[PDB]
Design a protein around this ligand. Structure first.
Ligand SMILES: [Mg+2]
Ligand SMILES: [Mg+2]
Ligand SMILES: [Mg+2]
Ligand SMILES: [Mg+2]
Ligand SMILES: [Mg+2]
Ligand SMILES: [Mg+2]
Ligand SMILES: [Mg+2]
Ligand SMILES: [Mg+2]
Ligand SMILES: [Mg+2]
Ligand SMILES: [Mg+2]
Ligand SMILES: [Mg+2]
Ligand SMILES: [Mg+2]
Length: 117
RNA sequence: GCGAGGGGAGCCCUAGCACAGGUGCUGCAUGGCCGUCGUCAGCUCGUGCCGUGAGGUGUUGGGUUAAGUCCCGCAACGAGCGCA
């Protein structure tokens, strides 16, 4: 059922902005718009969720992210409904890399709850 | 020591030694203090990111303000010397 749902209404959309690499992942390009390969997508989904199966059970944490409007809300509920980290708003430069200083802002957060109750 | 006479401290003259004192230089040897641009809106540090590097980014941009004042946006995130 996971396969036919995708085939339903969740594939192909972009046009005239394609990379040479995303081309081999393509199935066709009629009406002037690209059409992603559903078959290869499944196989990739398999390999991905395999990494998910390990990652989830390893106890590790996934950092979700999406600034696109169509994904801000979707990833929002789905990240909380899993307790996993995520950022829908404008991603900051250094969040992962310069993490030490980004955390200082998280520390400024607890200060708020202090003078909030 | 009853008296004579002797030495020391305080203080002086004369002779002699070490030394004092100098509004005599050098404000390009300096401390300190002061004028000045100008109360003008500025100048930087920490880490991250870009560049081979000098360095950039932040502090640029849009609105606003006496002001780097505040807001929104932002590969940047905070802080410090200033403004208040
Ligand atoms: Mg469905
Ligand atoms: Mg063409
Ligand atoms: Mg941002
Ligand atoms: Mg005598
Ligand atoms: Mg002399
Ligand atoms: Mg001088
Ligand atoms: Mg001087
Ligand atoms: Mg002179
Ligand atoms: Mg480098
Ligand atoms: Mg080179
Ligand atoms: Mg620099
Ligand atoms: Mg600069």
């Amino acid at each position: 059922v996971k396969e036919l749902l995708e085939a339903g209404v969740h594939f192909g959309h972009e046009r005239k902005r394609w990379n040479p690499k995303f081309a081999r992942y393509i199935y066709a390009e009629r009406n002037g718009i690209h059409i992603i390969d559903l078959q290869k997508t499944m196989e990739e989904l398999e390999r991905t969720f395999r990494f998910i199966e390990d990652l989830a059970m390893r106890g590790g944490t996934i950092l979700f992210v999406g600034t696109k409007k169509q994904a801000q809300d979707i990833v929002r509920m789905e990240a909380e409904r899993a307790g996993m980290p995520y950022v829908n708003q404008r991603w900051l430069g250094g969040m992962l890399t310069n993490f030490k200083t980004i955390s200082q802002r998280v520390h400024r957060l607890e200060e708020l709850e202090a003078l909030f109750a």
